[PDB]
């Protein structure tokens, strides 16, 4: 998980257009139980890329917000 997350970060730094690398980075954050860190990274990516059609990213955001509970409105959206 540490090595995979580092590799995903290096992939993102090499070419920022690789959305799949960032999604794998978030998945690795989830793997390391970094719920808050993954949430912050996902919010940063979504706010920078509000027009991106990453359906799985939005599904993961909704699941995370439902687990949080207070952010139900973003989860619905």
């Amino acid at each position: 998980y540490v090595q995979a997350q580092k590799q995903f970060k290096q992939a993102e730094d090499s070419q920022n257009s690789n959305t799949l690398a960032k999604l794998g980075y978030a998945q690795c954050l989830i793997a390391r139980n970094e719920v808050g860190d993954a949430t912050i990274y996902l919010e940063k990516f979504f706010k920078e890329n509000q027009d991106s059609k990453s359906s799985e990213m939005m599904l993961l955001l909704g699941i995370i917000y439902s687990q949080s509970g207070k952010s139900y409105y973003k989860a619905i959206i």
Binding site: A31, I63, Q67
Partner: peptide, 13 residues
Amino acid sequence: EIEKEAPQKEFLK
């Protein structure tokens, strides 16, 4: 089942 932390972890990962 997705309301439990462990299945959530398994599904997301």
